[PDB]
Nucleic acid binder design. Structure first.
Ligand code: ZN
Ligand code: ZN
Ligand code: ZN
Ligand code: ZN
Lengths: 76, 72
DNA sequence: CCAGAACAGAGTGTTCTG
DNA sequence: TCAGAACACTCTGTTCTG
């Protein structure tokens, strides 16, 4: 049965930083947590984040990472 | 003075028919030539400003067209 | 199996030129 | 005048490595 990234709904590769995610959201989260952490949404902070649109809004992608429970300590 | 009609950034001059910055100038050219299928993650109403213009090419491109940008 | 590094490509914006 | 080239920099996602 299918394993689904809890952030962008792409096929998940495994449990990364505590949450079932794809490889691209894994490394996106690590980069967001180590980066400028100044993200702006051009929308309403509800942007659709899927395989097609996840590049559009780093702010909403990162919000969904946090909301899903991702953390660098990789606590479940 | 001198404001980009697309993203509100300081405008360099009149490009492809409209007063725009350089980033919007080259973005528009790249978009017209460049095949792309742009899709808004929003409502097709995105805020386009100096930082936010990067987020939504679809809305940036739409504003470009609606402002009258033309390859001549 | 998973974190992190490394690699390569896409996207963006500036500088320079005539 | 502004269009184009091209350089330089950021963001992304897959493949490697430990
Ligand atoms: Zn994902
Ligand atoms: Zn958003
Ligand atoms: Zn602009
Ligand atoms: Zn949009």
């Amino acid at each position: 049965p299918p394993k689904i990234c809890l952030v962008c709904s792409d096929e998940a590769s495994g449990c990364h930083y505590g949450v079932l995610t794809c490889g691209s959201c894994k490394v996106f989260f690590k980069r967001a947590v180590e980066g400028q952490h100044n993200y702006l949404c051009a929308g309403r902070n509800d942007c659709i984040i899927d395989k097609i649109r996840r590049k559009n809004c780093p702010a909403c992608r990162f919000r969904k990472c946090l909301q899903a429970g991702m953390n660098l300590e990789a606590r479940k």
